[PDB]
Design a protein around this ligand. Structure first.
Ligand SMILES: *[C@@H]1O[C@H](CO)[C@@H](O)[C@H](O)[C@H]1NC(C)=O
Lengths: 48, 44
């Protein structure tokens, strides 16, 4: 659902979906090829 | 080897994000040509 998220201070707007991407444990939020935030990690449930 | 087709859906980002999808999400769209390749082949 298109929502105005705010993940640990990172603001934006978009639909959030379950991700097949597997973050390494040290990583926090992903980035696209054009250097835009593509994936994030939930600060509460540690979901990607 | 080639721009729009029906790219309105980005396949749910199931495999990274292609350059076309990244371009589309910031105002950069590609209009399709008026004459499809079938019509060009018919003219030829
Ligand atoms: C945050 O707290 C919730 C319960 O409120 C818990 O389920 C979750 O695992 C916690 N996250 C941590 C400890 O990273």
């Amino acid at each position: 659902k298109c929502v105005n998220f705010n993940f640990n201070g990172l603001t934006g707007t978009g639909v959030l979906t379950k991700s097949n991407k597997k973050f390494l444990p040290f990583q926090q939020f992903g980035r696209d090829i054009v250097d835009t935030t593509d994936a994030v990690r939930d600060p509460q449930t540690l979901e990607i | 080897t080639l721009f729009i087709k029906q790219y309105g859906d980005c396949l749910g980002d199931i495999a990274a994000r292609d350059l076309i999808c990244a371009q589309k999400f910031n105002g950069l769209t590609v209009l399709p040509p008026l004459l499809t390749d079938e019509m060009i082949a018919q003219y030829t």
